[PDB]
Tab-separated table of C-alpha atoms and ligand atoms in Angstrom:
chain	number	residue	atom	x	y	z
V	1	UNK	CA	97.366	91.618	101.367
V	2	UNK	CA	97.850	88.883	104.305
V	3	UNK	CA	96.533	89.966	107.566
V	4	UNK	CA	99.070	90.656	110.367
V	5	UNK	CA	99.139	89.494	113.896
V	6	UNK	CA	99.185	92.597	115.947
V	7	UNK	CA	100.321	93.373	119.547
V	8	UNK	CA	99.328	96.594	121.275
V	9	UNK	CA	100.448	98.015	124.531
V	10	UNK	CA	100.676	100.613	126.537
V	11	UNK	CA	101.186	102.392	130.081
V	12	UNK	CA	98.348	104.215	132.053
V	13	UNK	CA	98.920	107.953	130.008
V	14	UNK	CA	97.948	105.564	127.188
V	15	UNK	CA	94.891	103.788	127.952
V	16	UNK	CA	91.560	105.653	126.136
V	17	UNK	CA	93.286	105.573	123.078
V	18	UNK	CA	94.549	101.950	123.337
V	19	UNK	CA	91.431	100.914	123.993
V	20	UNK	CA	90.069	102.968	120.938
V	21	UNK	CA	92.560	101.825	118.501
V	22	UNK	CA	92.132	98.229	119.710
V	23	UNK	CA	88.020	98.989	119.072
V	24	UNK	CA	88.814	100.594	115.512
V	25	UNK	CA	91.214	97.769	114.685
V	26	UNK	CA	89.424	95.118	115.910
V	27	UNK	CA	87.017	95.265	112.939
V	28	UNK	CA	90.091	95.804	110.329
V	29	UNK	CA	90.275	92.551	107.695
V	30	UNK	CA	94.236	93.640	107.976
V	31	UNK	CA	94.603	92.359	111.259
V	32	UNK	CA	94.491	88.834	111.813
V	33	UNK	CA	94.907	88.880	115.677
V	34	UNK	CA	95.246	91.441	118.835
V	35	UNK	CA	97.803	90.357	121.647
V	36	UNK	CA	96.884	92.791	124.163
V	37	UNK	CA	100.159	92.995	126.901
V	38	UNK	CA	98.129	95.628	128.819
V	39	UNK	CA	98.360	97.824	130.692
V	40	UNK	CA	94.465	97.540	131.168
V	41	UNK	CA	93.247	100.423	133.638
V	42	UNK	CA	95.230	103.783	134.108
V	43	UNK	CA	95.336	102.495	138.125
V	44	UNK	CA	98.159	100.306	136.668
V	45	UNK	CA	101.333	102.403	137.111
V	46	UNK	CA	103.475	99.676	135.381
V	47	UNK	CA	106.635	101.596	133.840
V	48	UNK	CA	106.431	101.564	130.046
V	49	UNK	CA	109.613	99.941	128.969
V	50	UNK	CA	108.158	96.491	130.668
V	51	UNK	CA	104.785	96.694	128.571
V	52	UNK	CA	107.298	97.886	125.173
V	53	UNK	CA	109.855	95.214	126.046
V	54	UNK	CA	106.947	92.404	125.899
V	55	UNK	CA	105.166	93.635	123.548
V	56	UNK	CA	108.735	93.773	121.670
V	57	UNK	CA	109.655	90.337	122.600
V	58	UNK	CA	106.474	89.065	120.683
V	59	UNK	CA	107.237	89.669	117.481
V	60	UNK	CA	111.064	88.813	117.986
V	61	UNK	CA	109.642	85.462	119.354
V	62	UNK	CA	107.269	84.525	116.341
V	63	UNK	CA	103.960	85.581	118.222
V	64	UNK	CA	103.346	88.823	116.317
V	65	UNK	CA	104.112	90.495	113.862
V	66	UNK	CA	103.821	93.893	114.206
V	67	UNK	CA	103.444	96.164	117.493
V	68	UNK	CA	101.115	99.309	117.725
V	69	UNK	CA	102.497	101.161	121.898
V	70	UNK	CA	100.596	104.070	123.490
V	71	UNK	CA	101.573	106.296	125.814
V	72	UNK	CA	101.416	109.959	126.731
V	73	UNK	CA	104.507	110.775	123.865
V	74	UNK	CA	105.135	107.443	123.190
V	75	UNK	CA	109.287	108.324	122.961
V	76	UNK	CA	110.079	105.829	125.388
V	77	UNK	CA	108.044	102.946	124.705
V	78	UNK	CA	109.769	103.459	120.760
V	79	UNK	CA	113.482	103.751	123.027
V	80	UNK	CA	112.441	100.245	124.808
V	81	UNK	CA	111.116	98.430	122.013
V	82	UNK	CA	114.326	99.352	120.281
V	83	UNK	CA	116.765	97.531	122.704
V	84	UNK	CA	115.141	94.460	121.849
V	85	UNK	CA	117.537	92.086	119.181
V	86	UNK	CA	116.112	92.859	115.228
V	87	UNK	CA	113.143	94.861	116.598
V	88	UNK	CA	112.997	98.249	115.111
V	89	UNK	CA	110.444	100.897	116.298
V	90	UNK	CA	109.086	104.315	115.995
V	91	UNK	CA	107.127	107.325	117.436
V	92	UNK	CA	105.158	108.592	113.832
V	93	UNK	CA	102.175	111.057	114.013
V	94	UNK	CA	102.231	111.775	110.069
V	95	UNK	CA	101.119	109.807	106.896
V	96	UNK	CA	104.410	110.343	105.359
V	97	UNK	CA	107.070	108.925	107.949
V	98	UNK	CA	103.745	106.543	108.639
V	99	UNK	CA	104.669	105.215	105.387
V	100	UNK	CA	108.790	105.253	105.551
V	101	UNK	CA	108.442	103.669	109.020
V	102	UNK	CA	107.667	100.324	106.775
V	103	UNK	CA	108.431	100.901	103.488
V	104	UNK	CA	112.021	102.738	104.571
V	105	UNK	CA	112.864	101.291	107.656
V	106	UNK	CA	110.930	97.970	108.207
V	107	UNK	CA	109.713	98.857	111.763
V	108	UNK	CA	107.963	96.213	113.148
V	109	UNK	CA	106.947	98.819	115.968
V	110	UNK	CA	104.430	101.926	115.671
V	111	UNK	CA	104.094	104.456	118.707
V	112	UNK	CA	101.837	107.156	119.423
V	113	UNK	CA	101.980	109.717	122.001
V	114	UNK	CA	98.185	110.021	123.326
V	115	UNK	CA	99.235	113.584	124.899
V	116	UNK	CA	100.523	114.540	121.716
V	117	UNK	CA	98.291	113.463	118.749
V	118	UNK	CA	94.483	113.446	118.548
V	119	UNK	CA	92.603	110.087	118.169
V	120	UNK	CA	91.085	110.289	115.020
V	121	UNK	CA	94.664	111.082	113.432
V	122	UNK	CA	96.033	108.469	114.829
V	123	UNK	CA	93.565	105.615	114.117
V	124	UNK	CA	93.598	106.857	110.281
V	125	UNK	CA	97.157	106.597	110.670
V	126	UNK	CA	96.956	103.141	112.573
V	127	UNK	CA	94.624	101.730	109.280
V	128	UNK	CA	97.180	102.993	106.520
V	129	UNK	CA	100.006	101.490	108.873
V	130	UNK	CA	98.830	98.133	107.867
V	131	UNK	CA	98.611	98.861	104.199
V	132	UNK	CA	102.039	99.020	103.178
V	133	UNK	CA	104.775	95.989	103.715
V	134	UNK	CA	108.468	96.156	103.252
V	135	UNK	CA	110.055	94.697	100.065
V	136	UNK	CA	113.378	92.892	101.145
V	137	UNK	CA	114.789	92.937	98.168
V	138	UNK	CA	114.919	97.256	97.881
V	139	UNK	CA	117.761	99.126	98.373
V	140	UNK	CA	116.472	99.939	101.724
V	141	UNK	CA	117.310	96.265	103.277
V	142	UNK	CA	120.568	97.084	102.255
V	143	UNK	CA	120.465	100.130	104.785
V	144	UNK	CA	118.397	98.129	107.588
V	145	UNK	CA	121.115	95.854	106.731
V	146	UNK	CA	123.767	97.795	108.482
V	147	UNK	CA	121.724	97.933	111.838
V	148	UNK	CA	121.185	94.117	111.863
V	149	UNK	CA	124.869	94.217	111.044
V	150	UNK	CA	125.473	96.414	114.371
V	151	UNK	CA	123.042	93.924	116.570
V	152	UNK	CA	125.718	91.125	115.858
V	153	UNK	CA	128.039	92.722	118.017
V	154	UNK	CA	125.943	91.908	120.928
V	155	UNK	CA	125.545	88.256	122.793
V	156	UNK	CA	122.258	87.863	125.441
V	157	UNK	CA	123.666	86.056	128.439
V	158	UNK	CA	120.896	86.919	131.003
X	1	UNK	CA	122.797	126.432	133.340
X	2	UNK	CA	126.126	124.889	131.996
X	3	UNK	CA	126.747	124.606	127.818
X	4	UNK	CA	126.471	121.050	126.187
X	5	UNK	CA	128.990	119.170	123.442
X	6	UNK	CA	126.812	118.641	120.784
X	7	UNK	CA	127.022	115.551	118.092
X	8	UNK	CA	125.399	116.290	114.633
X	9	UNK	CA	124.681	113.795	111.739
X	10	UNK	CA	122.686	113.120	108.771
X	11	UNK	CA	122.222	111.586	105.719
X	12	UNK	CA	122.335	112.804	102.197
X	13	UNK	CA	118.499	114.053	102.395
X	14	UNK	CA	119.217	115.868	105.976
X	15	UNK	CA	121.917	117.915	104.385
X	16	UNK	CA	120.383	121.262	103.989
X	17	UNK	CA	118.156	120.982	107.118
X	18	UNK	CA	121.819	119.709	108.874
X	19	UNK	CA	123.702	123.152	107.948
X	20	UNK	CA	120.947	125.787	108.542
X	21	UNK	CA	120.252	123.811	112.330
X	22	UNK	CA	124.254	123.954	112.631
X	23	UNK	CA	124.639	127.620	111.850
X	24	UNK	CA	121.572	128.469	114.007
X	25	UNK	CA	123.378	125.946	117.158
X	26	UNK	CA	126.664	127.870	116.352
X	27	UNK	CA	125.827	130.941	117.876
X	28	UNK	CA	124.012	129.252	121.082
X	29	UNK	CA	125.606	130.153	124.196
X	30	UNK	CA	124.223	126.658	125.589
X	31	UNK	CA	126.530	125.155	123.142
X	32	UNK	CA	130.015	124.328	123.776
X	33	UNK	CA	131.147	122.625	120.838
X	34	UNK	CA	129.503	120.816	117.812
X	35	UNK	CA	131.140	117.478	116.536
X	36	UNK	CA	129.727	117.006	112.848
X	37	UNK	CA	130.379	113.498	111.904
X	38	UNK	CA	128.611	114.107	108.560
X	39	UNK	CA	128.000	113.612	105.522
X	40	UNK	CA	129.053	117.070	104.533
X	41	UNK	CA	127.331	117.068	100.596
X	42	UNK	CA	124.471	115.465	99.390
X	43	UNK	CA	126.891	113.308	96.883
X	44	UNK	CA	127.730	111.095	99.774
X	45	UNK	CA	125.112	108.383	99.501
X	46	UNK	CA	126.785	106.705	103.466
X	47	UNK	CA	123.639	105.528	104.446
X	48	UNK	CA	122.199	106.704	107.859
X	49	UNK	CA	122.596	103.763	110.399
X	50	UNK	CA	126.528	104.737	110.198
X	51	UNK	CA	126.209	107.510	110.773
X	52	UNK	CA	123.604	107.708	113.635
X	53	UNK	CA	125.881	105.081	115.446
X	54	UNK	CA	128.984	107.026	115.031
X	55	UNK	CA	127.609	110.266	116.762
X	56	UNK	CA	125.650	108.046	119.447
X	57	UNK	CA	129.212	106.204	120.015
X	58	UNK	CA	130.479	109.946	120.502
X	59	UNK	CA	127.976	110.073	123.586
X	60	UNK	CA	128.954	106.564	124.959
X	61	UNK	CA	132.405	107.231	124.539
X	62	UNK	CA	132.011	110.678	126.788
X	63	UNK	CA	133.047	112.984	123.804
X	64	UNK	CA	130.052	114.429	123.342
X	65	UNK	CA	126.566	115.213	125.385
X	66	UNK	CA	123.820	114.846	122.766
X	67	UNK	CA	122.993	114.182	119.295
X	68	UNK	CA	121.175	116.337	117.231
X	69	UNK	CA	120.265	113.820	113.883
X	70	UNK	CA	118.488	114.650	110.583
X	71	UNK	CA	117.483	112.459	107.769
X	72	UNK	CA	114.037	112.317	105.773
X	73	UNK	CA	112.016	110.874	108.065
X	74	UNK	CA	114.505	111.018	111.302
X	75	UNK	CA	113.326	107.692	112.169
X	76	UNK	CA	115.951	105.440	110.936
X	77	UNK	CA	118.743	107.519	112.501
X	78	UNK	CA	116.999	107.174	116.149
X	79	UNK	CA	115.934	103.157	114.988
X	80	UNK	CA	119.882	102.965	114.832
X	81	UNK	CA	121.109	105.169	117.320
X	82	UNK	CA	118.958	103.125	120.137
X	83	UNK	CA	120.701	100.264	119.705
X	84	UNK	CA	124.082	101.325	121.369
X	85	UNK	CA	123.908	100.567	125.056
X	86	UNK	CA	123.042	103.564	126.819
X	87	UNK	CA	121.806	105.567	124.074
X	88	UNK	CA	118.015	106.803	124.297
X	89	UNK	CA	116.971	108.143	121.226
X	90	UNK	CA	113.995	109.727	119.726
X	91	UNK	CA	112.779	111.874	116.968
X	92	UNK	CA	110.410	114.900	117.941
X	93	UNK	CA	108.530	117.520	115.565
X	94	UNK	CA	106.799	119.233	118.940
X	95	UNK	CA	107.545	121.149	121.792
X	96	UNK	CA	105.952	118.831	123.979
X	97	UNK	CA	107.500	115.783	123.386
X	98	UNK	CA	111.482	117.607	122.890
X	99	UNK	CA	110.164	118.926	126.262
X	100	UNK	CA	109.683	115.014	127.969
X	101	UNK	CA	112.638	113.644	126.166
X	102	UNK	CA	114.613	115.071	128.068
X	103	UNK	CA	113.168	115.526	131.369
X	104	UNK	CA	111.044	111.698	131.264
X	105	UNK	CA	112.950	110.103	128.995
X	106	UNK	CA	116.593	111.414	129.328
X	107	UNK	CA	117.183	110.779	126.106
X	108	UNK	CA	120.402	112.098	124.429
X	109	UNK	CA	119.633	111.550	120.659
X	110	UNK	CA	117.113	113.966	119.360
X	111	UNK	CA	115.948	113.662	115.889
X	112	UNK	CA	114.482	115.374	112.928
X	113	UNK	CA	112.543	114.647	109.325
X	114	UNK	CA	113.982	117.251	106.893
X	115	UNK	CA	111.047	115.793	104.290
X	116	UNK	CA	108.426	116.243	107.469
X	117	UNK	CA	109.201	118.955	109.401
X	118	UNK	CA	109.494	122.875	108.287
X	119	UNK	CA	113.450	124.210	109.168
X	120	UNK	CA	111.981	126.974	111.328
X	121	UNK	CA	110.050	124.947	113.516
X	122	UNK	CA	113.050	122.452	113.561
X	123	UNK	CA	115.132	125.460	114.522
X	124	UNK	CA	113.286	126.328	117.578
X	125	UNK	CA	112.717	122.859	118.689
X	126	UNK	CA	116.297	122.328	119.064
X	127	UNK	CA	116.338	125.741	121.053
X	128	UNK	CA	113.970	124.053	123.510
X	129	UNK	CA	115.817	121.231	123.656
X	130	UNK	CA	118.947	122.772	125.169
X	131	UNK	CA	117.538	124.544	127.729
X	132	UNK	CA	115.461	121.449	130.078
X	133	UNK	CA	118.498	118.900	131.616
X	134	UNK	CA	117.039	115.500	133.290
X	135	UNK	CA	116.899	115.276	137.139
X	136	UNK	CA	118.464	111.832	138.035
X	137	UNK	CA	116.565	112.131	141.441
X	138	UNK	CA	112.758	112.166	139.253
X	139	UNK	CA	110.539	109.691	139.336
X	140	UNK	CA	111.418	109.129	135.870
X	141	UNK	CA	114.569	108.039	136.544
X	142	UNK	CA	113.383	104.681	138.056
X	143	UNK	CA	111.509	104.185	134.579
X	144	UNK	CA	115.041	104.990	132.725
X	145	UNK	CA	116.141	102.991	134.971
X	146	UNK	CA	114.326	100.124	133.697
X	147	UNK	CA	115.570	100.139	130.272
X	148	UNK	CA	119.336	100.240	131.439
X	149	UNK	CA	118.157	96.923	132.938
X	150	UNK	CA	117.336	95.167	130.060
X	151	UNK	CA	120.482	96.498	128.987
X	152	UNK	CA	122.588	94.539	131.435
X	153	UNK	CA	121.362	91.295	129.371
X	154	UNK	CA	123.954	92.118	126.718
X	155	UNK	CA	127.948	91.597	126.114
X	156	UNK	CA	129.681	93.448	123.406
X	157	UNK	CA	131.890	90.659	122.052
X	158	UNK	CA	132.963	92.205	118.558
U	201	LIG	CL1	103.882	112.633	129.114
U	202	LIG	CL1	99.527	113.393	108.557
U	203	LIG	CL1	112.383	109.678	103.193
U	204	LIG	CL1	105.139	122.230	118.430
């Protein structure tokens, strides 16, 4: 498989395991490039939906392709990321929706709540991430279809 | 505290999950009324971005209070349910994070994987969920706050 350009963010509740995952990743033939949006120390009380929405705007932009966000549940950084035009996102702590999140539901965006899920779970979860790419031609794009299809109701004017 | 309108959806594989949560809600004396927008039999094959943005449309539209969404994963229905302006939505399988959707995140939508999650544990989630209500005055309001922002970027034109 091609490697992917990643992004990873997240806000301070997030930062051991970002930098963990960015470690474990770093060495992964999968993963062609790390954009790192921050945030960089947990002294940096940034909100999350600035580091999502950035992170976000990278792969709507061309710069990325895929976005792994941390923070303590990592609910709203997946909320954020989600207001973005064509970006879809997710909170997933199991192999299974893991899986769906790409296969299912061609989420650019993975989130994991550090306060939530352990670290070893969710770097084993972070590797198989990578592993699986959409097929656009399933009967699933038919369904992501339909939110693309609601997006068009919507014109960005600031 | 006062009883919420309740929304409930899911697809054709959050059927059976979808009936034993809205029997168990029925009897809740936090619960005012439930609004099921469907679908009602696992025949109807209406895939899950309807209706996620029907029930979230119920919220915007003040008919409702919150969402309660099921499909196989539960990621799909919050993926779509996101994208109406002023929706928050996320899906949850612990009492943690149910716990800071609500009170960080405010988030109305709360969703579940029938094909993840076990129905008892699903049941008492959406217990929890009931009983926490967001203080607008929080610190995590001003972080809400944020994503409403990027919100103001967008006209509904169609
Ligand atoms: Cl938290
Ligand atoms: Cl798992
Ligand atoms: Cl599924
Ligand atoms: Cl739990």
């Amino acid at each position: 498989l091609p490697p992917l350009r990643l992004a990873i963010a997240c806000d301070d509740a997030g930062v051991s395991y970002k930098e963990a995952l960015k470690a474990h990743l770093s060495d992964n033939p999968l993963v062609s490039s790390i954009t790192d949006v921050g945030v960089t120390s947990t002294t940096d009380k940034t909100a999350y939906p600035h580091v999502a929405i950035q992170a976000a705007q990278l792969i709507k932009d061309g710069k990325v392709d895929r976005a792994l966000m941390i923070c303590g549940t990592g609910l709203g950084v997946a909320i954020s990321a989600n207001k973005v035009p064509g970006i879809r996102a997710v909170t997933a702590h199991d192999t299974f929706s893991v899986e769906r999140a790409i296969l299912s539901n061609d989420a650019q965006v993975l989130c994991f709540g550090q306060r939530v899920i352990g670290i070893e779970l969710a770097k084993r979860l972070a590797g198989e991430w990578l592993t699986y790419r959409f097929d656009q031609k399933s009967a699933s794009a038919q369904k992501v279809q339909a939110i693309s299809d609601y997006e068009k109701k919507f014109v960005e004017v600031n």
